[PDB]
Structure 1
Amino acid sequence: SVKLTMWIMPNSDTPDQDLLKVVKPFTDANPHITVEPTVVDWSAALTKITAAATSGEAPDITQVGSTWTAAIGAMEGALVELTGKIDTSAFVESTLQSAYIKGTDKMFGMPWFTETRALFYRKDACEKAGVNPETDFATWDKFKDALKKLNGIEVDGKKLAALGMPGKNDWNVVHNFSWWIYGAGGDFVNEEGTQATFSSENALKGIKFYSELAVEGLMDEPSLEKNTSDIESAFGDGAYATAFMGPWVISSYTKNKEENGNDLIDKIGVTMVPEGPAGRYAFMGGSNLVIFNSSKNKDEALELLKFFASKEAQVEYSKVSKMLPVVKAAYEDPYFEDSLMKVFKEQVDKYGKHYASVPGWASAEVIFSEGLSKIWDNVMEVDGAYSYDKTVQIVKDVESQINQILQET
């Protein structure tokens, strides 16, 4: 007998159950293998995985944020090198770069699922505001015009803010800036992933355009006090006409209707992020699976990773979590005719961009999460009036620390 244990990060209200619903076909076909999941929340996962990699007090397998894979894989003796042990031909090509350490041929993770952030909107709010959501969000400038018409629009006598986005420190702080920087024609690092470049003229143009949506009263300023989960909940309670969110919120809003009669789910659509002067760009994230080098059943652990990559497990995991599969064949399933999920798939395939898969990137995100949240503190005027000039200084200070981190490699 073999007791396979794995850590998972939560994106639903029942993560352990969702997972067991997906691996049940595997366990029914391998009676000598048991699988026990354990939840590790996102804010603790990097610290916990890093500690477990060196102490050996670890499960056999852990989910890992795609942007962290290289950081963990670069830890000597931390993970099983998967190079050649998994068949990557079946995978969506673009998902594989985050499974390797950039500049090496070393694959330390297997892509598990993909996610991007799309523009959710209230159909009823748009109709009343005279906003056509199929056309009026297409570009930065049209998006901004639409927000002005949606600002303070009322549905059933309650005012909505035009755009609700979090500003508090969680991992999504940098993710929510990413595609504004990209769409302006900037990037976080050079091609090699070895120096920071997000104080460039173009990067700052994107930072200024996005952050000043709140200065101008279009993005809701009080919501910048809150984190992603709180703003997701607020949108589900009707607080905002629009919000940029991942696909998993659809599970939450569907449950809110089933349990509470909250019909928000029936009032929303989703469209791609607005196009900037560089063309359209979107955040590409998701998670990979890795096998700890300390695993005493690497044969079974590797067997379980291959099952998670099977067409049926990918379809079923996508159904329960709303995440996108990383296996091309899953998308032939009728389920992906869904009007909302189609948007996330088209956006990530055509316009998705993932960070450089470098070992220092995980540590960089810690600095991004604290550093860039100071931009929202500036906008929120908690220490003096807002000024763009203070944002520029915040960004330059973050860049210096990122460069020192990248130089450790």
Structure 2
Amino acid sequence: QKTLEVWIMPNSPQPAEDFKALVAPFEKAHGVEVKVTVLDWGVAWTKITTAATSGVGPDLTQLGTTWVGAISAMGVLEPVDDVLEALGGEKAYLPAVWRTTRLEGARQATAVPWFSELRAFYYRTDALKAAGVNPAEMFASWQGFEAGLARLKASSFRDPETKAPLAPLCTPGKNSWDVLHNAAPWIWGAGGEIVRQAGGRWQSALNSPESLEGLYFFLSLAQKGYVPAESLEKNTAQIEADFQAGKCAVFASGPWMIQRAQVPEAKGGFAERTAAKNLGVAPYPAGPKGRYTFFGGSNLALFNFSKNKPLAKELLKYLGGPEAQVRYAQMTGMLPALRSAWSDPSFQQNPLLRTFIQAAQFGRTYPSLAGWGGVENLAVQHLGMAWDLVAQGRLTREALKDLMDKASAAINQALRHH
């Protein structure tokens, strides 16, 4: 009759149902009830920070890897070094994954790695073929990326269901954390970054010459008509929905879309759509200073005001452990956080998934900072205003610089305090 409450984000298309089937064996072996509540990504920051400040909430909460340091810095998370030792310690994890178990420079781990994700480009094989585009040259370089989009815009190809052209590229301009995650590769590729350590402190680098170069190149794809105006007002889920509906030739996303492509519309997938029958993946192109993609995922954290700490730690060890690592990655189409589970043969057979796995050497993420929640909110707000400059025909290098100088002022405030 002993019970646990868990907060999760929508990691699969039937998230509560998938999470319940995942924990059913643990419920049987301990004779306990695990309750699950689903928080949309757009409101999860608001709801998790309120639970933290109020001292009331669940036993466990999913945390995006980029939030672990920001929640940890509030002093509301129970140490989980014991759980991670029981899962095989530092050596069981990719160094980049291990760094998401804590606030940078904290002694104690405060989250357990649950799943990994990184970004690549999904494209329509039938569209790039009709346009005469070589996917290998389109996704090899900025120049190539731009040339491929120009061909996709000039193409007379029409989706056989919609009977209408495809937008060359769709990217979300509003409301998602992905307004930051989708700009990051371009910034990094130009030799830029989101933040930089100097003058003793962390500050915004979104106004560095190289950051402006990468961000401007990204924004100018919309300026040139490769991204439709409508896309700049939309969020992640809508861009996913536009691709599934046969309206976009190319978009940036995570390994989950592969799982969706294999499942019917009734189960929140798109197996019956033209796009699922014509699905390609290519990595992010090399920029002038490097080849990068966003690498992230989600960890599980235990609030220090939980009344069932020993039982919730047993559940973290279960979810962080090999068997649940494999089953949840299968249900979600995410990559296991436990490095050993990448080698499970169920992940070796899928050709599109292999593209994601082998793209991981280009994966980069943000330092695990106390101000990071604020940085992401302000980044989403200010980058969405840069997309606005395009919708208005007002995008210039000076206007972008002025806007990123204001984003930088505000981000510097957030890195001092909450």
Aligned twin of 1:345? 357
Question: How many Å separate the matches in 1 of 2:197 and 2:346?
Answer: 37
Matched, 1:283 2:291: no
Instruction: Flag the 1:404–1:258 CA change in 2: closer, same or farther, 3 A.
Output: closer
Amino acid at match of 1:68: W
Pairwise CA distance, 1:104: 2.2
| Aligned ranges 1:59-98 → 2 under 5 Å | 59-76=58-75, 78-87=76-85, 88=89, 89-98=91-100
Aligned twin of 1:129? 131
Q: 2:181 aligns with which of 156, 161, 175?
A: 175
Question: How many Å separate the matches in 2 of 1:92 and 1:326?
Answer: 8
Q: Do the aligned residues in 2 keep the contact of 1:257 with 1:264 (CA within 8 Å)?
A: no
Amino acid at match of 1:269: G
Pairwise CA distance, 1:309: 1.4
Question: How many Å separate the matches in 2 of 1:407 and 1:333?
Answer: 43
Task: Say what the alpha-carbon RMSD is for the aligned residues.
Answer: 1.7
Give the unaligned 5+ runs of structure 2: none
Aligned twin of 1:242? 250
Matched, 1:196 2:204: yes
Aligned twin of 1:395? 404
Pairwise CA distance, 1:72: 0.8
Q: Do the aligned residues in 1 keep the contact of 2:9 with 2:62 (CA within 8 Å)?
A: yes
Output the TM-score relative to the length of structure 1.
0.94
Aligned twin of 2:344? 333
Matched, 1:141 2:143: yes
Question: How many Å separate the matches in 2 of 1:169 and 1:395?
Answer: 18
Aligned twin of 1:13? 13
Pairwise CA distance, 1:54: 3.0
Pairwise CA distance, 1:92: 2.6
Amino acid at match of 2:14: T
Over residues 204-250 of structure 1, what are the superposed CA-to-partner deviations in whole Å (9 max), with x where a residue is unaligned?
Answer: 11011100001011122321111111011000011111111122223
Over residues 26-75 of structure 1, what are the superposed CA-to-partner deviations in whole Å (9 max), with x where a residue is unaligned?
Answer: 222222x2211111111221111111123232111000111111111111
Instruction: Flag the 1:219–1:27 CA change in 2: closer, same or farther, 3 A.
Output: same
Output the TM-score relative to the length of structure 2.
0.92
Give the unaligned 5+ runs of structure 1: none
Instruction: Flag the 1:385–1:53 CA change in 2: closer, same or farther, 3 A.
Output: closer
Amino acid at match of 1:198: L
Pairwise CA distance, 1:98: 1.8
Over residues 234-279 of structure 1, what are the superposed CA-to-partner deviations in whole Å (9 max), with x where a residue is unaligned?
Answer: 0001111111112222333333467773232110110101111122
Question: How many Å separate the matches in 2 of 1:106 and 1:194?
Answer: 22
Pairwise CA distance, 1:404: 1.4
Aligned twin of 1:159? 165
Pairwise CA distance, 1:346: 2.0
Question: How many Å separate the matches in 1 of 2:245 and 2:211?
Answer: 34
Pairwise CA distance, 1:134: 2.9
Amino acid at match of 2:301: V
Question: How many Å separate the matches in 2 of 1:2 and 1:257?
Answer: 37
Amino acid at match of 2:368: S
Over residues 320-351 of structure 1, what are the superposed CA-to-partner deviations in whole Å (9 max), with x where a residue is unaligned?
Answer: 10111111221222221211112222222x01
Amino acid at match of 1:64: L
Matched, 1:364 2:366: no
Q: How many residues align?
A: 404
Over residues 273-305 of structure 1, what are the superposed CA-to-partner deviations in whole Å (9 max), with x where a residue is unaligned?
Answer: 111112210101111100011111111101111
Q: Do the aligned residues in 2 keep the contact of 1:152 with 1:159 (CA within 8 Å)?
A: no
Which region of structure 1 is more displaced relative to structure 2, 384-393 or 311-320? 384-393
Question: What secondary structure is seen at the aligned counterpart in 1 of 2:136?
Answer: coil
| Aligned ranges 1:301-340 → 2 under 5 Å | 301-337=312-348, 338-340=350-352
Which region of structure 1 is more displaced relative to structure 2, 185-194 or 272-281? 185-194
Q: Do the aligned residues in 2 keep the contact of 1:99 with 1:107 (CA within 8 Å)?
A: yes
Q: Do the aligned residues in 2 keep the contact of 1:112 with 1:326 (CA within 8 Å)?
A: yes
Amino acid at match of 2:122: F
Pairwise CA distance, 1:25: 2.2
Q: Do the aligned residues in 2 keep the contact of 1:152 with 1:162 (CA within 8 Å)?
A: no
Question: How many Å separate the matches in 2 of 1:314 and 1:191?
Answer: 35
Instruction: Flag the 1:215–1:256 CA change in 2: closer, same or farther, 3 A.
Output: farther
Over residues 84-130 of structure 1, what are the superposed CA-to-partner deviations in whole Å (9 max), with x where a residue is unaligned?
Answer: 44223322322121221112223211111111111011000111111
Which region of structure 1 is more displaced relative to structure 2, 36-45 or 50-59? 50-59
What is the identity percentage for the equivalent residue pairs of Structure 1 and Structure 2?
39
Pairwise CA distance, 1:83: 2.8
Q: Do the aligned residues in 2 keep the contact of 1:184 with 1:277 (CA within 8 Å)?
A: yes
